[PDB]
Amino acid sequence: AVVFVNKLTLIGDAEEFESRYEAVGAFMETQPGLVRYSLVRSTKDDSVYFNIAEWDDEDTFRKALAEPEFRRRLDALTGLIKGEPHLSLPVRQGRAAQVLENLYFQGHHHH
Amino acid sequence: AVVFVNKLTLIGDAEEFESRYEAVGAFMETQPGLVRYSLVRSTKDDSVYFNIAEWDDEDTFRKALAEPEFRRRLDALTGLIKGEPHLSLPVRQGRAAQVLENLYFQ
């Protein structure tokens, strides 16, 4: 898996930016290789967002990025945000299933 | 849910940073409210990492950070990285959908 992380700086209207991002996320949802994505907004500095997307691999991320209609919805955000994008590799991970498993094992093993 | 994002800049040895971060990840996994976390390293600028940690709510995140053991293991990263921390609220999210989803008319 690869994890796309874009640190966004809001330079326009927050509500307009977020509604337009909706169409980007909608499109990503049936792009091959997309696992999940989240747009999150900092509570410390509300001009700071992060676009975070997990992809099966680098090749599927590459092929999705090139799709004209995806790029059209992405381009509709230019002028509302500036981006500092990072295609990134997982280095250490606490998977949800494993976090849950360690909890219920400690509680139900009765060591 | 809330998503903590820390943009980390490496200022020492990457291998030791990553080994010492193992202890931080381990302790997080024992704390009430943790959903999941990933530490990822940028392939554009390899001095950049992001810690991305998902918690049930701000409350559980704040309560975990009040643990002395958590603070001890964070303090062991001093000199290896610098942080830009952001507790963040999900604004939009989704996951892989079925291409045929709308053709059931359910």
Residue numbers in the entry:
A (entry chain B): 2 to 112
B (entry chain A): 2 to 107
Tell me what the authors wrote about this structure, in their words:
Rishirilides are a group of PKS II secondary metabolites produced by Streptomyces bottropensis Gö C4/4. Structurally, rishirilide is a tricyclic partially aromatic polyketide with an unusual isopentyl sidechain and a carbonyl group on the third ring. In this study the involvement of one cyclase and two oxygenase in rishirilide biosynthesis was investigated. For this purpose, excision of rslC3 gene using the markerless time-saving CRISPR-Cas9 system, inactivation of rslO4 gene using Redirect® technology, and crystallization of RslO4 and RslO1 proteins were carried out.
The monooxygenase RslO4 crystallizes as a homodimer and the overall structure of each subunit is made up of three α-helices (α1–α3) and four β-strands (β1–β4) with a ferredoxin-like fold. The additional α-helix in the C-terminus of each monomer is generated by the TEV protease cleavage site of the His-tag sequence, which is required for protein purification. The interface between the two monomers is further stabilized by hydrophobic interactions provided by β-sheets and side chain hydrogen bonds contributed by Lys8, Ser43, Glu85 and His87. The closest structural homologue is SnoaB from S. nogalater, with a sequence identity of 41%. Closer inspection of the active site of RslO4 revealed high similarity between the positioning of Asn7, Asn52 and Trp56, which are represented by Asn18, Asn63 and Trp67 in SnoaB coordinating oxidized dithranol by hydrogen bonds. The high similarity of RslO4 in the sequence and three-dimensional structure with the monooxygenase SnoaB suggests that RslO4 mediates a mono-oxygenation in rishirilide biosynthetic pathway. According to the observation from molecular dynamics simulations, Trp56 contributes in the orientation of substrate positioning inside RslO4 pocket through an H-Bonding network with the three –OH groups, which in turn leads to an electron delocalization in the third aromatic ring. The results of dynamic simulations match those of the Site-Directed Mutagenesis which demonstrated the importance of Asn7, Asn52, Trp56, Tyr22, and Met29 in the catalytic mechanism of RslO4.
